[PDB]
């Protein structure tokens, strides 16, 4: 659930999920269209696509459990939806951390009309 993804973000990047990742580029927070504007935005695009392969689950509200062996994210066994939601989130966080060095403030609150074109998952 969003509860988890967001604390996972915070633990990983050091930034708060809502301001920093809730409205970035074209795909972070409201995804529907356009070309992702960067790494971080692409992370969100792969993330939205990951949720996409789970039409019968509920990403934002279904809670899963996870632990850290050392720095590593390890998803604990739950329902099949929960394990798979957890795997999509783990990816996004790592993806966010691997591209922190190019995170740009100019893509915060990015206007909708500047997101043009479909891109296939």
């Amino acid at each position: 659930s969003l509860l988890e993804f967001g604390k996972m973000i915070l633990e990983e990047t050091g930034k708060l999920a809502i301001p920093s990742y809730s409205s970035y580029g074209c795909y972070c927070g409201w995804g529907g269209k356009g070309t992702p504007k960067d790494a971080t935005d692409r992370c969100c695009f792969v993330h939205d696509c990951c949720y996409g392969n789970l039409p019968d689950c509920n990403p934002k509200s279904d809670r899963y459990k996870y632990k850290r062996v050392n720095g590593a994210i390890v998803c604990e066994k739950g329902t099949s939806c929960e394990n798979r939601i957890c795997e999509c989130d783990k990816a996004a966080a790592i993806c966010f951390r691997q591209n922190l060095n190019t995170y740009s403030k100019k893509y915060m609150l990015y206007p909708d009309f500047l997101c043009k074109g479909e891109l296939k998952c």
């Binding site: 509860l3 809502i18 990742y21 927070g29 934002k60």
Partner: peptide
């Protein structure tokens, strides 16, 4: 704590 995030998005959508």
């Amino acid at each position: 704590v995030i998005a959508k």
